[PDB]
């Protein structure tokens with residue numbers, strides 16, 4: 001005898017709200033979408049010093065969840081005939097022609113299998129010229145295509161190439177093409193002055209206010225900021241790609257296509273994919289040190305799961321993000337915080353909520 005909106009709010013209170021005190025997190029937004037109905041829950045402060053409450057207008061940094069938009073942009077360019085995933089980067093960034101990195105194809109860049117690209121660019125690589133020199137100086141290590149090492153430079157280069165193929169800077173690919181196509185009106189690579197009042201402070205581990213700093217190829221790797229309503233709309237788009245024009249529908253579907261496996265994890269384009277129902281440990285394994293921080297040999301997909309789910313975590317210095325959706329259950333969840341919390345806690349809390357919501 002309790003309305004569903006209250007049932008979902010109670011589940012989020014039971015599973016996400018305690019994380020605020022446990023990790024001293026100033027502000028949090030959690031959203032659930034089920035059967036095209038959205039439920040938004042806001043807690044705490046987007047700015048401690050300004051006593052400004054988290055609300056539907058609050059803009060949060062998505063960290064690596066930005067890679068889902070980069071992947072969507074690549075799927076869009078591929079389906080418009082602007083790139084093939086079998087192309088190499090020198091076809092588009094001409095200064096890379098006939099360098100060793102020009103042996104790596106675009107899908108391998110997007111899915112982290114070049115064989116010699118680390119988590120981050122070197123600290124000293126900052127300017128556009130330094131980024132170019134870094135890729136010109138790149139040499140192979142492991143055999144191309146065989147080992148996954150999650151990597152910002154890898155998918156960053158993919159995003160730069162996607163942008164070159166579309167004749168626009170990457171920030172404009174998202175702000176002028178991809179965000180409008182997905183119906184997102186409060187999502188940004190660069191937050192404009194007229195929206196800075198809505199941009200949350202992030203909070204470091206000392207609870208000091210901070211925001212993300214510029215970095216090499218930051219936009220395609222971790223450059224997006226968004227609101228809870230926009231992220232629910234993005235989940236809706238992933239749950240209902242048939243509701244978009246052909247090129248955008250196909251772009252979304254590209255991001256859902258698993259490309260290879262590492263144990264129980266399927267690497268799609270940006271998204272991680274799993275057979276559903278997934279055990280909690282399967283989902284935790286995807287964020288283990290072994291999977292995130294080390295190279296792992298990839299295997300071809302054997303079981304192509306008809307019933308599946310997708311997720312991605314992201315963090316910046318001052319923010320945490322988790323997004324997850326389950327197509328055949330018509331459900332998804334978004335968590336945004338303005339302080340990092342352990343990825344396992346995000347995954348566990350979402351798992352508990354999603355499994356307990358009545359169908």
Ligand SMILES: *[B@-]1(*)O[C@H](CC(=O)O)c2ccccc21
Pocket residue numbers: 063064065119152287292313314315343
């Ligand atoms: B991008 O995605 C992962 C998210 C995570 O496991 O916390 C990541 C970690 C470190 C840098 C960049 C990313």
